[PDB]
Swiss-Prot record, chains A, B, C, D, E, F, G, H, I:
Membrane topology: Single-pass membrane protein
Consequences of knocking out this gene: Disruption of tatA affects the correct localization of multiple enzymes whose precursors bear twin arginine transfer peptides. Export is completely blocked when both tatA and tatE are inactivated.
Keywords attached to this entry: Cell inner membrane, Cell membrane, Membrane, Protein transport, Translocation, Transmembrane, Transmembrane helix, Transport
Protein name: Sec-independent protein translocase protein TatA
Gene: tatA
Lineage: Bacteria, Pseudomonadati, Pseudomonadota, Gammaproteobacteria, Enterobacterales
Amino acid sequence: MGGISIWQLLIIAVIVVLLFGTKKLGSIGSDLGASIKGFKKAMSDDEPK
Amino acid sequence: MGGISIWQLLIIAVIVVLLFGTKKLGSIGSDLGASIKGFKKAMSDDEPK
Amino acid sequence: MGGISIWQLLIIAVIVVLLFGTKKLGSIGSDLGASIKGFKKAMSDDEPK
Amino acid sequence: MGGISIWQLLIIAVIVVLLFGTKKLGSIGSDLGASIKGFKKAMSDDEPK
Amino acid sequence: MGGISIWQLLIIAVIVVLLFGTKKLGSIGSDLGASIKGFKKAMSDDEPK
Amino acid sequence: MGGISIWQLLIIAVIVVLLFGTKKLGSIGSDLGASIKGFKKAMSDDEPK
Amino acid sequence: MGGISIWQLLIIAVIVVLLFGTKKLGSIGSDLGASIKGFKKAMSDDEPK
Amino acid sequence: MGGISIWQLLIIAVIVVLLFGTKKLGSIGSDLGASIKGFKKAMSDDEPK
Amino acid sequence: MGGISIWQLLIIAVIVVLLFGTKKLGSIGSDLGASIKGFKKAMSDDEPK
């Protein structure tokens, strides 16, 4: 029947990390993760009036 | 079924992004996405906030 | 059966585009698409837009 | 059981075209297609003008 | 049992080590293993000031 | 996958032709086909002449 | 079907040896095998070698 | 039946010939085939007719 | 154990020979085969020439 295997994602993800490396992926993720920081903050101010 | 797998597109798309890179693909998409901006605008003129 | 796959064309087409690139393929297609312009015109002398 | 697949020719033909390219294959085919032009011409008897 | 193979990780891990090498991976691991040293120490110091 | 397949020769032959090319293979074959010309001639005396 | 294949290790080991070579692997092994020499000696104090 | 893989040798042999080429392999074989010439001669010294 | 997939060794061995070549492997083997010469000589007691 249909394959649809999660293991396929692990091998693919590994290749992506190796080609982009892990150190570089850190700056890219954190750089693009700036928007996430805002969502988290809005859904949890805890500080302002 | 196995005949039609969406996963095949994920792996192919990944290769395309790696070969064309992500930064370069940004300028290419935005450059070619100029026409889209017009469609969005036109379908938004006849509808104010 | 399990030998005729439409997906086979997608992967092959992708390779062709990458090897020939997309920008270069533009000039080649438009250059060779000159004959098509004539067919369209002949099958349509007038045009509302 | 499998054995003779027409699709096998499509993939092989694609490789041949890519390795030899399409522009180069044009001159080679037309250059070697000179003999064909003669056959067509000679058999022009059974073809009203 | 068919899919889901632990062995898949061994082959993948080997590739990662070869591409990143073993000597280089040493400095990277030890460099990033600095945080681990703190966890081990805290869970061993058991003596606040 | 597969066994005792004639198709294996087609793919291999294609590779040989591409690596050696077709134009070069022409001179090599004709150059080495000189002995064949003699066999054909001898088996075609038709008369003492 | 059997993922657990001993033969997989032979092919992988061969690649490692070729990439690292055999002469270089000699110095690396002997250099890192210094600790082993001590284990052997300690477990054989009552037996000079 | 089976249990053997002769075709495997044909593909491997082809690769060897392509990597070493055919012209170069000629000099190498003839150069190393000098010993064979002696065996043939000795096993023909007794009497060629 | 053994007597299976033996063909896997032939293909692997071929790759090793090609990567290390045959001429180079000669000096390496003979150089490392010096110890063997001694074993053969010592066991000359129970083996006449």
